[PDB]
């Protein structure tokens, strides 16, 4: 729910002003469907600690290839406009919050 | 030469007699770019044993989802309009050949 | 009756003469959910000739990789501790019966 | 200096009796190839303080999974066999120097 990223708006949309959690997803991806509500809820619950961004790899090959994405879904946390943490994309709320403890504090 | 398939024509294209090796790939996928020339060479060497088809998952989510694809690339061998073997998509030509030894015999 | 296996007990479960039909599935996979009731009825009807186990791929990544599962649903029949047959895709009662006529002896 | 690491010798080398900078890469990864010359130069002016090693993710699945590598290039600095810093994405010389300095004395 917070932002839709594209190869065109990525560079700007992920600069300075606040941590951005990018979810690399695909329409055909099953786990991404299970993760969709988890991320929506996460975005709502920590809307002031971080911004959740969605990058549909189906339509955005440059960014996806640029980060050497290997599996869908994949999560990458950006701070100061730079990727600082990477996580497998399938994560229950508990595990997701535990690993992102720092930014949520 | 490889055969390009879409969600719209996939069903008719895999209707049996004459094995079809389907490569589920994406342009942003690194291993897929490594395999492109490999599969084209493979197709040229075994054209009268099997047809190599390519299904771009970025553009064809229906077929991809129908087969519960989880990672790309993925190779699925079809015989009789039915999927009979599933293979890791990123493999050297020599390993692929061993894996498909029966259809190549 | 469709006992559940995991990465922690899979190996010894199959490391036996005992014919075991393993159902590789996930909650997000429609055809997988379509086959759960069929398999439950199947396990009940042929309990004397085969034991039906379920392996959720999202929760058990080790087993999923070891057996190169790239497409779900997939059924793998183990005999003597080794996979002897794989069935890819939704299998209605009649197909399962026909395909597994062997173990059904 | 560019010692090659594998699933077999990684943990051992990481318990390296000194800091080790591991470069996670693949032959399909452009920014990774771009980073290769940069890392060699770094390994040079810091060969008394750190060893630079390479781990190909395509050929070494266990290490790749062990460290949750979802995006490459990725560098992980180990100090005492434990990961102490992780850098994601291309790092120009100036960045490598600034980010790893606290390990450069």
Swiss-Prot record, chains A, B, C, D:
Entry keywords, A to Z: Disulfide bond, Electron transport, Redox-active center, Transport
Highest taxon of source: Bacteria
Domain Thioredoxin: 1-105
Covalent S-S links between cysteines: 29-32
Record GO terms (molecular function): protein-disulfide reductase activity
GO process annotations (BP): cell redox homeostasis
Record carries keyword Transport: yes
CDD domains: TRX_family
Gene3D superfamilies per the UniProt record, alphabetical: Glutaredoxin
GO cellular component: cytosol
Function (record text): Participates in various redox reactions through the reversible oxidation of its active center dithiol to a disulfide and catalyzes dithiol-disulfide exchange reactions.
Family per record: Belongs to the thioredoxin family.
Name of this protein: Thioredoxin
Native source species: Alicyclobacillus acidocaldarius subsp. acidocaldarius (Bacillus acidocaldarius)
Gene that this polypeptide is encoded by: trxA
């Amino acid at each position: 729910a917070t932002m839709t990223l594209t190869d065109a708006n990525f560079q700007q949309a992920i600069q300075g002003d606040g941590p951005v959690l990018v979810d690399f997803w695909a329409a055909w991806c099953g786990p991404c469907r299970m993760m969709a509500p988890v991320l929506e809820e996460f975005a709502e619950a920590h809307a002031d600690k971080v911004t959740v961004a969605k990058l549909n790899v189906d339509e955005n090959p440059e960014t996806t290839s640029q980060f050497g994405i290997m599996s869908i879904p994949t999560l990458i946390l950006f701070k100061g406009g730079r990727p600082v943490k990477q996580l497998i994309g399938y994560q229950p709320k508990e595990q997701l919050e535990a690993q992102l403890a720092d930014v949520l504090q």
